Amino acid sequence: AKLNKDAENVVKKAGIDPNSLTDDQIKALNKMNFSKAAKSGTQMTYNDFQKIADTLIKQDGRYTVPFFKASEIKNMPAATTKDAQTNTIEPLDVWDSWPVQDVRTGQVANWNGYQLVIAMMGIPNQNDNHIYLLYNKYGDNELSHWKNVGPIFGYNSTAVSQEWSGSAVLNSDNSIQLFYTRVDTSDNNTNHQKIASATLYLTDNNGNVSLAQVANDHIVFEGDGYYYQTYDQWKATNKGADNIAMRDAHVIEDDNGDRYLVFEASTGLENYQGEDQIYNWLNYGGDDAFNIKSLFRILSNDDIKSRATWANAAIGILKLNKDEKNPKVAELYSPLISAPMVSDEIERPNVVKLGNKYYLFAATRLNRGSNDDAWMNANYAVGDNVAMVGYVADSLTGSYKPLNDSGVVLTASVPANWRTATYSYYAVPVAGKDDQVLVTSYMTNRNGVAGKGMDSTWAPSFLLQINPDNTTTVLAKMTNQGDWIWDDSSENLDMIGDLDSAALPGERDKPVDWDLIGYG
Ligand SMILES: OC[C@H]1O[C@](O)(CO)[C@@H](O)[C@@H]1O
Ligand SMILES: [Ca+2]
Ligand SMILES: [Ca+2]
Incomplete structure (x- = not known):
């Protein structure tokens, strides 16, 4: 029935009358x-996440x-192809994709006059998760020319051994x-899940x-238990x-010759x-009133309490040894970003060097966060x-510091079941500029939800x-759709839509697709 002094301090800093609190609220506060x-590392706090969501709601x-002008959107012809599991030619979903990049600069690599992209594809509504290699003439802007x-790991594949996202760069011998x-x-x-290389x-x-x-295929890392x-x-x-996550490894080398992987994971026992975690004040990150309001909200709802109990998404980093073709772990570090109490999924981490700063971007679905409201x-x-x-x-x-106060960079603008819905945003540098990136993404959510x-x-x-x-x-x-290389000639303002023409x-x-967007 009686607050400890720390707890009474924050209650009073918050402008809350201590007498107004219940026995359960006092007990919650005394555990803080x-x-x-x-x-x-740097945390996405409960306050940050709330701000990201508020920003999305504001549609600024x-x-x-x-x-995107919905009338201009079409399936990728190269996504009609021989399927890794059925061995038959089918129109596949293509989703998460990444270009072969220069290991230092991130620029889309010019390989013998080609650009190369590796992409997840599969038959809609099947468990069919494998990666395929795609190519086009370097600089070419036509989706249909890809x-x-x-499939990189061949035909006669099965769902028992799958390939999910990562990254790709040129070695010294091309x-x-x-x-x-x-x-x-x-x-x-x-x-x-396991981070692997070949x-x-x-x-x-x-x-x-x-x-x-395909040579030297092996497991690089699958978690240590502490970090x-x-x-x-x-x-x-x-x-x-x-959630379980050990994926989306992004390779980058700095000017000291050290090669690193930045990857999606969850925190360990560190x-x-x-x-x-509901009782660690550091996780909340707001003012006193916000933090207290937030604590009571979490404890008032079993689903929020449960999500908070299980949330600990991390963007990890490790250093590799020097062996380009047979990388092994040389050193592990604490997460660059973590979201204990806040979210259990932050995906497709990506590092872009611009000038002498390192920009760390990632995609996330806010419905993997603890704040249901x-x-x-x-x-x-x-x-x-x-x-x-x-x-x-x-x-x-x-130390990584959030952009735009809360870490928000892009927010959804259309319903998840529309043709022009996007996800898995992936920033790529632009030749000659240190203050722009080109944001790529896949369009239309998987498994025929848009029809x-x-x-x-x-x-x-x-x-x-x-x-x-x-x-x-x-x-x-x-x-145009599927352009990985921005230049003056790449612009197509006809692809720009508005609220009306995005549908x-x-x-x-x-009707809403509720499984797709979630409901607490
Ligand atoms: O299909 C699995 C892949 O999809 C993502 O969840 C994002 O769409 C990635 O984290 C993962 O590599
Ligand atoms: Ca977790
Ligand atoms: Ca282009």
């Missing part, structure tokens, strides 16, 4: 740990993904070092690129509320998920809850201005 020491043009070489996620589903169909040797014969050989959550840790306590309000306002977040550091393993034969395809790309004061601004500068006829009267 007020230590301000950071454990797993500085951050909204631009409207060509599918085929072979390709692929980083990807090896997913083994033999332990009761669980998505046992070397791709290609050949160039009369306008066609072929995959000659990053292991499969065994997740399996031990999972009753269905805990700062682990648990109900205790915030993301259910996002859904109600826009029909979706996706975002790109961003941070910036002066060195690769340095008959509306496959996931490549979005038109758009420019994002990076300002020197750790802010960003979306530009009204757009390409195909009928889409406005279409």
Whole structure:
């Protein structure tokens, strides 16, 4: 019935009369740990997440993904191809994709006059998660000119061993070092994820690129238990509320010759998920009134309490050894970003060097966050809850600080079941500029949610201005679908839509897809 002095201090700083509190509220407040020491890097706080959501709800043009003219959007021809699992030619969903990049600068690599992209594809509504190599003439702006070489790990594949996202760069001899996620589903169909690497040797014969050989395929890392959550840790306590993530490895080398992977994971025992996290003041990150209001809200609702108990998404970093073609872990670090209490999924981490700063971007679905009100309000306002977040550091393993106050960079602008819905935003540098990136993404959500034969395809790309004061601004500068290389000739202002033209006829009267957007 009686507050400790720390708790009475914050209550009073908050303008709350201590007498107004219940016995349960006092008990909650007396458990609060007020230590301000950071454990797993810079945190996305409960306050940050709330602000990201508020920004999405405001639909402010500085951050909204631009409207795309829905009438211009088409399936990717190269996504009609021989399927890795059925061995039959099918119209596939294509989603997460990444270009072969220069390991230092991030620029889309020119390989013998070609640009190369690696992409997740599969038959809508099947478990069919494999990666395919794609190519086009360097600088070419036509979606339909892209060509599918085929599944990197071959035909006769199955759902028992899958490939999820990662990254790709050129080695010294112009072979390709692929980083990807090896997913083994033999332990009761669980998505046992592992960061893996292999070397791709290609050949160039009369306008066609072929995959000659996949060499050195091996597991690089799958978690240590202290910095990053292991499969065994997740399996031990999972009753269905805990996410598992060890994926989306992004390779980057700095000017000291050190090569690193920046990847998606969860924290380990360094700062682990648990109900205790609801009682760490550091996680809240607002003023006293906000923090107290937030604590009571979390404890008032079983689903928010549960999400908070299980949330501990991390963007990890490790240093590799020197061996380009057979990378192994040389050193592990604490997470660059973590979201204990706040979110259990932050995806596709990406580092772009611009000038002498390192910009760390990532995609996230706010409905993987603990604050149900915030993301259910996002859904109600826009029909979706996706975002790109961003941070910036002066060195690769340095302290990352959020952009635009809260870390918000892009916010959803259309309902998740529309043709022009986007996700898996991936920023790529622009030749000759240190203050813009080109944002790529996949368009149309998977598995036919936008209707008959509306496959996931490549979005038109758009420019994002990076300002020197750790802010960003979306530009009204757009390409054709599937353009990875911005230049003067790449602009197609005809692809720009507005509120009205972002929908195909009928889409406005279409029912909500609730499994897609979530509901607390
Ligand atoms: O399909 C799995 C892939 O999709 C993502 O969740 C984003 O769409 C990535 O984190 C992962 O590599
Ligand atoms: Ca978790
Ligand atoms: Ca282009």
